[PDB]
Amino acid sequence: SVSKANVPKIDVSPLFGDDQAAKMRVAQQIDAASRDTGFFYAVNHGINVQRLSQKTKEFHMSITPEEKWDLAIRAYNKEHQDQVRAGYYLSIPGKKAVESFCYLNPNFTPDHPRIQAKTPTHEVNVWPDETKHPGFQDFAEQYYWDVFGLSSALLKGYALALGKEENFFARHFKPDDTLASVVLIRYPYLDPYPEAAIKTAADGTKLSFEWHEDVSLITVLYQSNVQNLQVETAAGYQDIEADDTGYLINCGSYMAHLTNNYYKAPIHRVKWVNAERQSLPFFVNLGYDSVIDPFDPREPNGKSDREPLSYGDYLQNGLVSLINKNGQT
Numbered sequence: 001s002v003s004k005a006n007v008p009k010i011d012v013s014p015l016f017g018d019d020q021a022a023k024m025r026v027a028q029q030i031d032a033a034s035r036d037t038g039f040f041y042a043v044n045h046g047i048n049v050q051r052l053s054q055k056t057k058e059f060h061m062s063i064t065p066e067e068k069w070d071l072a073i074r075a076y077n078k079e080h081q082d083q084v085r086a087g088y089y090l091s092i093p094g095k096k097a098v099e100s101f102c103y104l105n106p107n108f109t110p111d112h113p114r115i116q117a118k119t120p121t122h123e124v125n126v127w128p129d130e131t132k133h134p135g136f137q138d139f140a141e142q143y144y145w146d147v148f149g150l151s152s153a154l155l156k157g158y159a160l161a162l163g164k165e166e167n168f169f170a171r172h173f174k175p176d177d178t179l180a181s182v183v184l185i186r187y188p189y190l191d192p193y194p195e196a197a198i199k200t201a202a203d204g205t206k207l208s209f210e211w212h213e214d215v216s217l218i219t220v221l222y223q224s225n226v227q228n229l230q231v232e233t234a235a236g237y238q239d240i241e242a243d244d245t246g247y248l249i250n251c252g253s254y255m256a257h258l259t260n261n262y263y264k265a266p267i268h269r270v271k272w273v274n275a276e277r278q279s280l281p282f283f284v285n286l287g288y289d290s291v292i293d294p295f296d297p298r299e300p301n302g303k304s305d306r307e308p309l310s311y312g313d314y315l316q317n318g319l320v321s322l323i324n325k326n327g328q329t
């Protein structure tokens, strides 16, 4: 058998309040999870996830090929040279099943200083026509701030977990400059299913997306109720069970870096399953100039020999490395 990953459910609600001991008890849980398989479900998070999946379903189901081309990233539309991150990621019938729509900080506007300076990884979001998708852009911008709020709370948990004051991570995660993204991903049911869209792992397992570590500080993921994820352990891959009421949380490689690998970025992969489903990750990224000084929780003195790494640079390299290893999504 493929075994089952232990993915605890952590009530994160005290992270929004002022009961300091209760926050430490949430922190310990985040610590235990981060040192084990590296995944947990955040429960009692305060976000309406039923409204999230609904609005996301309307959008993916009603968008037309015309509109997809209008919103297409550079990978799919030569005319959109500025769209590296934000825009539509098209499926290719017969070949590629997954499709998605990525958007960035809504404060990135033409008169935002990083946009005026043409800084790498900052882009102005593109949206569909309001009349064809009424309320979608309002829904998505508000979602961005909702999951922003949740992530800030989670980062207070991680900071306490590592013995730091609660603002250690969160001080660098700001509405004005955060490079965080939301990706609205559709995995379709297809019959017959395109072979080119299925990968075979060394271990024989059929996959939608190969093994990887996330490019992020942490990743805050909502998915519908179809079991698909696996995490790598010394004993091989273990299945991560679905929970469409919670947020699945894990560390990305920037956390692994900062902590001298004390909190690993868990390697994980996406099994092929022939079922309609949604995956809505929020990648918790900092500001372009954010630097956190690496440290080592194992050492009495906490000292690390690792270089501080600037977030904008880490992100740029990471996104490029991911496309190279696992392909254009």
Ligand SMILES: C=C[C@@H](NC(=O)[C@H](CS)NC(=O)CCC[C@H](N)C(=O)O)C(=O)O
Pocket: 084, 085, 086, 102, 180, 181, 183, 185, 209, 212, 214, 221, 270, 279, 281, 283, 319, 322, 329
């Ligand atoms: C997180 C789940 C999802 N995986 C993925 O999307 C894979 C592995 S996390 N990640 C990516 O492609 C990084 C997208 C970054 C985004 N465009 C941005 O510019 O910030 C899946 O379900 O395949």
Ligand SMILES: [Fe+2]
Pocket: 212, 213, 214, 268
């Ligand atoms: Fe991932």
